[PDB]
Design a protein around this ligand. Structure first.
Ligand code: HEB
Ligand SMILES: Nc1ncnc2c1ncn2[C@@H]1O[C@H](COP(=O)(O)OP(=O)(O)OP(=O)(O)O)[C@@H](O)[C@H]1O
Ligand SMILES: Nc1ncnc2c1ncn2[C@@H]1O[C@H](COP(=O)(O)OP(=O)(O)O)[C@@H](O)[C@H]1O
Ligand SMILES: O=[P-]([O-])[O-]
Ligand SMILES: [Mg+2]
Ligand SMILES: [Mg+2]
Lengths: 568, 554
């Protein structure tokens, strides 16, 4: 597959691992400490058993090993409790840091880039694609560091007692990976033969479920169940051939964890009888040396078995890594933040001589254009669809980086502080969203601490109080796309309330009456025409019948204004 | 646990394949317990006998047991995973069908309130979750309940006290630990899903409102609110990970408790024999190996919590009463139809203002009418009553001077064919993407329609066999709309009411109305609805309407 990418992708993950490297070492250290307690377990049980079975020592006499075996059990359950808490803490700080880096890179990239992709798939990247990176750091890595350490302790702990039992466990150490690779050349062939189909045929139920409206109009409602049954009766028998060979890769681990316990039982069992006199260091084979190997025989393969379960969490954290790595490798262009100030709250005199507007992706938006209007002047933009007139409104707000020269009251916009520049700005898009939880908290978005009397003045000015009785809870009605939604006629009349609540210097109306009902249109226009003459404004409305009082009119067709002048 | 009853009757259908995986699960765990308890006994039986008793100790049979148990464990594990997944995939198709069959009568109405993008992605997510009920909650639990009984009865032939205290420890934790942890993580699991939807709702409203959260300076305040929810959310996740660590640390103590007790009490003796030579190792090694049977029980309270929560969502979604009912009269297919509307009103569920007020228009048969709504104002809502997705309230819909509610589902779909506002590619062959309109149609006739509507470009390279949808090539927005009319031609209906055909495309919008009058102009009625005032003069009775009411109709 993508061998060139996977090796590189599996390397980016380890660079993210350094955020919680302190706990990924404690979790690795506790893997060794939990390894020691397993041999400590297996020795006390073996020594206790040999004394009882062979020396017939009463249980009360050998109470010291009993109170030590219990202590290891408590001390071994403690590190197990402690490992999957340090493991979680190791995997949480990765998610917390990446989610902060993703949100940070998604906020200073501006709202110009967020429009490029639906907000549902942005929330799919911040919710699921970063939570999928948990079990790799929290469970898989603290386990892959247990599959290379713990099984080695057993071999190191039986080798002093019996080199024959040490080789039986170690004999399967190279044999297991070889056989998985020998069956992996057939499993990865069928998984490639069915790769086209299963990917094409797994999203079948969702597509039928997603297009039920189109599926019931034409009467195919009861004829697609015969196509969901037939696309799921094939999904089974096609993935039951990939599984049929993918479960041999685990059977050849259950084959060696059974051959290695049978051999340890048969070899040691025959060694006591005097058959196989080749394993011990010419000191006789004690019974306790057999139980130590027998108890540790399953513990050798326990780590290699559990790693098989968490191995799916490696591709899951890689399949969700190409979405996040390429997110933070985009060359997108920031708006070139700077520091400056505007002392006067009075209307600003914007101007330009040679200006270009470029997308974060790097594509240009508006060609060479230049315009000047002094303070108090109220311009208006008209043009064909796709001319780029909203870009100019979208770049006067600081959302789009410009490589030309735009000047705010004699001060370059490039070096102007965006955090303080926007305090002298008001913005009304054609399709405005309502991010606040409730309508009352939505009008008071510029100044939340506004007095209730000031709030009432804005509502009457914006003609939103007229339909207030229609909503159930009055002004505190929750607003959104799932609870008591406002019509576009009403939702536009509360965005107007936002802009006029806090006095500003430059007002950027972006087609306030584009998608708006006839009654609300005359209410908004009456409000926004009386609220545009007291400062510099920039309207980009497309209907142009009422432009008599708009002093200057700029028309642009292909990213450049062609002629500017009054309606007359 | 009463929410699982509807989704457990789909498992009883395959009870004779589901139970083979459980029986295979029992054997591969008995073969793994038996392999190690026999090894433990054989390891101590020979040591006590020593070299002196070599000729008086039958080792032929124990050596056959370790050989028999080794093959049984490795073969049983392989055949378990096949049969378990084979039955899991076979009940999956009975869950996809059951969900689809129930969700279909209420697809336009019962799914209106939810965000269709997240709702349907959720439904598929919690159909897979319900599919893993057997493979993680039944097979680990039912397969481990009888494994304990076999060893308890098996060890009961040596000593009743030792067999039962080991079985009593195992059976108690099987019946008591899963409930005491499902009862402890229930509050957190409910609170964890609330914050996941609260973080997703605040984040979506932060990215969508990013344009105006920065102009008004609230982009940093609503980020602190957003991150505070994440802090709460990541602490609910920690609590459910403080139970996974506690559940794993307890059965390593219970599994300990059942090892010392076998070491301790069996010293006194097994049966009447006060000096058990090798039978001490037969009980401690059985107890040592028999807690892998209850190992999958760990975490089976987390997997039971998601499954039961998933069963609630589907039940709360597929048990809604259909908003509209279709009486079955077996009426014949009407021809040359003509409807009419008289004061049709309709408000959506959980709404306080009507989306349709005082709608009244009369259409004759074979008449082309364009309804022009500038935005919203229920132009696409009006078309839903005609296709009968919702039932109008204080309204009357009459088709051929007869009520529309008298039509049965088969006949209503026949008389009315609509091109929706958003067209759907069904991820099948372009052949199978047009058979939706006509279930049975000759290919040669079908292939003529595509070249008739200007879509002959798709037939270049095995076009009728070319995959569409996500797998294949996606038709462009302008080109995709050209396919909806094709599906409205194969399924010829006396009433073919369109819905924004010209929206979103300009290169070929001029030619779009051409076939709207090239073959829809004969004995057909079209209720075309658009807000694009372009080449609409060829349509009589043009009607403009705003705020959900018809004004100054032509
Ligand atoms: C790639 C191929 C594959 C596939 C496709 C699959 C697909 C699947 N799957 Fe699987 N698995 C696997 C490969 C696989 N798989 C493995 C290898 C394992 C390990 C071994 C066993 O099985 O046991 C598992 C395991 C498993 C399990 C258990 C875990 C443990 O053991 O702990 C489960 C439950 C499941 C489910 C499932 C499902 C539901 C599905 C659908 C999607 N899985
Ligand atoms: N990030 C972006 N945002 C908007 N337009 C972009 C972007 N990147 C490239 N473009 C292209 O550049 C052109 C800029 O024109 P834009 O649509 O912004 O102004 P507009 O014509 O006033 O908008 P509308 O058509 O909605 O009135 C668009 O046609 C668009 O295809
Ligand atoms: N699923 C829904 N639930 C509640 N209200 C809705 C729903 N769909 C539309 N509405 C409301 O009904 C009005 C009519 O919208 P509609 O005509 O369907 O929009 P469009 O004309 O863009 O297709 C809208 O103002 C909207 O607020
Ligand atoms: O949203 P409008 O195209 O009906
Ligand atoms: Mg624009
Ligand atoms: Mg519509």
């Amino acid at each position: 597959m993508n061998k060139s990418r996977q090796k590189e992708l599996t390397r980016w993950l380890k660079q993210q691992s350094v955020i919680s490297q302190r706990w990924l070492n404690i979790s690795r250290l506790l893997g060794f400490v939990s390894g020691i307690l397993i041999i400590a377990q297996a020795w006390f049980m073996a020594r206790i058993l040999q004394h009882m079975i062979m020396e017939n020592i009463p249980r009360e006499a050998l109470l010291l090993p009993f109170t030590l075996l219990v202590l290891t059990f408590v001390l071994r359950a403690w590190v197990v409790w402690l490992r999957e808490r340090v493991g979680y803490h190791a995997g949480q700080h990765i998610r917390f840091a990446i989610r902060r880096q993703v949100l940070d890179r998604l906020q200073q990239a501006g709202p110009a880039w967020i429009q490029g992709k639906p907000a549902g798939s942005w929330a799919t990247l911040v919710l699921e694609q970063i939570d999928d990176m948990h079990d790799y750091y929290a469970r898989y890595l603290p386990q892959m560091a247990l599959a290379v350490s713990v099984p080695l302790l057993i071999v190191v702990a039986i080798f002093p007692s019996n080199w024959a039992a040490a080789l039986i466990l170690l004999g399967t150490a190279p044999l297991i990976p070889l056989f998985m690779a020998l069956v992996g050349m057939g499993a990865a062939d069928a998984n490639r033969r069915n790769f086209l189909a299963l990917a094409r045929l797994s999203g079948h139920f969702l597509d039928r479920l997603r297009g039920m409206e189109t599926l019931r109009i034409f009467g195919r409602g009861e004829a697609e169940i015969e196509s969901i049954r037939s696309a799921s009766e094939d999904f089974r028998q096609r993935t039951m051939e990939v599984l049929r060979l993918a479960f041999l890769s685990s059977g050849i681990l259950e084959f060696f964890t059974s051959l290695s316990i049978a051999l340890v039982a048969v070899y040691f069992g025959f060694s006591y009888l005097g058959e196989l006199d080749f394993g011990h260091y010419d000191t006789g084979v004690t019974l306790a040396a057999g139980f130590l190997a027998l108890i540790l025989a399953p513990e050798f393969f326990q780590p290699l078995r559990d790693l098989g379960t968490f191995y799916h969490a490696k591709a899951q954290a890689v399949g969700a890594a190409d979405s996040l790595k390429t997110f933070m490798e985009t060359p997108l262009a920031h708006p070139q933040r700077g520091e400056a100030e505007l002392a006067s709250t009075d209307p600003v005199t914007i101007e330009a001589e040679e200006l270009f507007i470029t997308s974060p992706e790097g594509k240009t938006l508006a060609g060479p254009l230049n315009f000047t209007l002094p303070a108090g002047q109220r311009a208006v933009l008209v043009g064909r669809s796709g001319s780029g007139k909203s870009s100019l409104l979208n770049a006067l707000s600081g959302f789009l980086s410009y490589q030309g020269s735009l000047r705010i009251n004699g001060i370059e916009l490039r070096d102007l502080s965006p955090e303080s520049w926007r305090k002298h700005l008001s913005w009304v898009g054609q399709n405005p969203q309502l991010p606040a939880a409730t309508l009352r908290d939505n009008v008071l978005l510029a100044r939340p601490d506004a007095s209730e009397q000031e709030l009432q003045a804005a509502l009457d000015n914006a003609w939103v109080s007229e339909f207030l009785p229609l909503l159930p809870q009055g002004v505190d009605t929750p607003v959104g796309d799932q609870a008591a939604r406002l019509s576009v006629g009403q939702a536009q009349r509360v965005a107007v309330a936002r802009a006029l609540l806090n006095p500003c210097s430059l007002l950027l109306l972006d087609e306030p009456a584009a998608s708006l009902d006839a009654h609300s249109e005359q209410r908004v226009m009456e409000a926004l025409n009386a609220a545009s003459l007291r400062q510099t404004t920039l309207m980009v409305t497309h209907q142009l019948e009422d432009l008599a009082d708009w002093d200057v009119i700029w028309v642009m067709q292909d990213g450049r204004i062609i002629e500017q002048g009054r309606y007359a | 646990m009463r929410a699982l009853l509807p989704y457990l009757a789909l498992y009883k259908r395959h009870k004779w394949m589901l139970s083979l995986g459980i029986v295979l699960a029992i054997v591969t765990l008995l073969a793994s317990i038996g392999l190690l308890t026999l090894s433990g006994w054989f390891l101590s039986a020979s040591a006590v006998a020593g070299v002196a008793g070599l000729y008086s100790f039958n080792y032929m049979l124990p050596a056959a047991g370790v050989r028999g148990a080794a093959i049984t464990r490795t073969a049983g594990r392989y055949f378990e995973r096949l049969v378990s997944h084979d039955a899991t995939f076979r009940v999956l198709q009975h869950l996809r069908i059951y969900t689809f069959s129930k969700l279909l009568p209420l697809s336009p109405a019962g799914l209106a309130r939810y965000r269709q993008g997240e709702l349907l992605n959720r439904v598929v997510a919690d159909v897979d979750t319900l599919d893993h009920l057997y493979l993680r909650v039944i097979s680990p639990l039912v397969g481990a309940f009888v494994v304990i009984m076999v060893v308890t009865i098996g060890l009961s032939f040596l000593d009743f006290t030792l067999a039962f205290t080991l079985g009593g420890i195992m059976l108690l934790t099987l019946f008591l630990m899963p409930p005491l942890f499902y009862r402890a993580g229930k509050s957190t699991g409910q609170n964890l899903t609330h914050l996941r939807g609260q973080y997703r709702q605040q984040l979506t409203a932060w990215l969508q409102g990013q344009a105006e959260l920065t102009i008004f300076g609230a982009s940093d305040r609503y980020r602190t609110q957003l991150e505070n929810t994440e802090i709460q959310w990541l602490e609910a996740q920690r609590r459910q990970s403080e139970l996974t660590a506690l559940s794993q640390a307890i059965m390593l103590l219970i599994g300990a408790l059942a090892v010392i007790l076998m070491l301790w009490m069996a010293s006194g003796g097994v049966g009447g024999n006060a000096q058990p030579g090798a039978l001490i190792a037969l009980f401690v090694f059985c107890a040592l190996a028999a807690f892998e049977a209850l190992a999958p029980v760990t975490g089976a309270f987390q997997h039971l919590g998601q499954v039961i929560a998933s069963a609630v969502r589907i039940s709360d979604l597929t048990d809604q009463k259909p908003e509209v009912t279709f009486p079955d009269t077996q009426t014949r297919v009407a021809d040359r139809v003509s409807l009419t509307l008289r004061d049709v009103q309709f408000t959506y569920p959980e709404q306080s203002q009507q989306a349709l007020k005082g709608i009244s228009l009369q259409v004759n048969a074979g008449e082309h009418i364009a309804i022009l709504g500038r935005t919203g104002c229920g132009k696409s809502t009006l078309l839903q009553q005609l296709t009968r997705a919702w039932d109008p309230q204080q309204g009357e819909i009459l088709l051929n001077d007869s009520p529309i509610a008298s039509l049965n589902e088969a006949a209503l779909r026949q008389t009315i064919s609509v091109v929706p506002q958003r067209v759907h590619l069904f991820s099948a062959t372009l052949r199978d993407n047009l058979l939706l309109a006509s279930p049975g149609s000759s290919d040669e006739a079908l292939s003529e329609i595509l070249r008739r509507v200007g879509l002959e470009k798709l037939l270049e390279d095995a076009g009728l066999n070319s995959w569409l949808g996500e797998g294949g090539r996606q038709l462009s927005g302008g080109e995709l709309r050209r396919l909806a009319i094709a599906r409205a031609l194969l399924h010829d209906a006396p009433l073919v009411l369109l819905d924004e055909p010209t929206e979103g495309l300009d290169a070929t919008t001029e030619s779009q109305i051409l076939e709207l009058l090239a073959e829809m102009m004969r004995e057909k009625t079209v209720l075309m609805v658009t807000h694009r005032l372009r080449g609409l003069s060829r349509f009589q009775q043009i009607i403009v309407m705003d705020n959900g009411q018809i004004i100054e109709q032509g």
